[PDB]
Ligand SMILES: [Tl+]
Ligand SMILES: [Tl+]
Ligand SMILES: [Tl+]
């Protein structure tokens with residue numbers, strides 16, 4: 001459960017690293033903005049304060065969403081049910 | 096079921112209070128706009144009428160989404176299946 | 191299954207009617223824009239071409255999302271698994 | 286499992302082709318922008334860099350979201366659990 005979470009954590013980080021490199025390079029964003037935009041994209045928030053301006057960027061974003069959404073939300077789910085929930089229950093009973 | 100819903104309700108409120116304080120303070124939003132933005136972020140609507148302008152804000156928003164989405168949608172689900180649904184079924188049969 | 195879908199269909203329509211009336215009135219949108227915005231909000235797309243400008247509107251939108259998301263996506267799911275899927279399978283076998 | 290994925294893949298492509306044609310034609314987008322916008326809409330990212338300006342476009346987008354979200358996310362799920370996951374597990378054991 002903990003190994004599941006480790007793996008999804010690593011996969012998420014690698015996905016976000018890929019987006020940070022791509023958007024910093026092709027769309028010219030500061031690395032911090034590239035990471036932020038990658039996260040806002042794959043969690044489907046999509047503020048649109050950054051959005052790809054190049055056709056290269058738009059095509060990559062299509063593929064990045066389709067490949068990355070499933071991973072991000074798998075990690076969010078496991079983080080919910082395997083880390084946050086136990087800590088919440090545990091806080092419910094003094095020791 | 097009702098205690099489950101109570102807990103998720105409290106956790107959601109606390110999460111939204113955290114975002115309201117942070118965005119009011121660091122991003123200078125009116126408290127009402129900070130709450131509204133927090134909700135629009137964690138439900139993944141993301142209009143982008145407010146979005147963080149500071150690097151502090153962008154980093155916090157990354158973490159806030161990852162930690163908060165799972166909680167908000169747990170609460171929405173329980174609110175759907177444990178409160179709204181019974182009332183809907185109950186309205187279906189006169190008394 | 192068909193009655194389930196009927197009910198969720200009616201509930202969705204009523205929810206969207208509520209948003210259309212509210213946003214047309216309080217935020218001054220054309221009714222068509224109010225419906226469009228209501229749909230874009232509750233499906234969490236959130237383009238932000240329309241977003242509430244009044245505090246009344248922002249508070250209503252907070253509550254509307256929390257109460258309406260669960261309903262809309264229940265309807266989308268049932269529409270997926272109970273209407274679209276059978277028609278797709280049925281198209282797979284000539285008659 | 287592979288046939289399931291094939292079918293959802295074809296259905297997704299057809300849905301995106303429909304949106305590309307419609308938005309290129311009625312909203313005057315370049316085909317590439319129409320595809321990009323279709324994807325950003327049905328995955329619920331919704332940057333809003335493109336959004337429909339015509340009433341025809343707004344009405345179509347309402348219907349497109351309701352009919353298309355369920356399909357897209359079915360495909361993303363199957364792509365997650367039926368293609369990405371096995372490859373990830375398989376990379377975990379040298380051969
Ligand atoms: Tl958005
Ligand atoms: Tl937006
Ligand atoms: Tl979303």
Ligand SMILES: [Tl+]
Nearest residue numbers: 045140235330
């Ligand atoms: Tl969104």
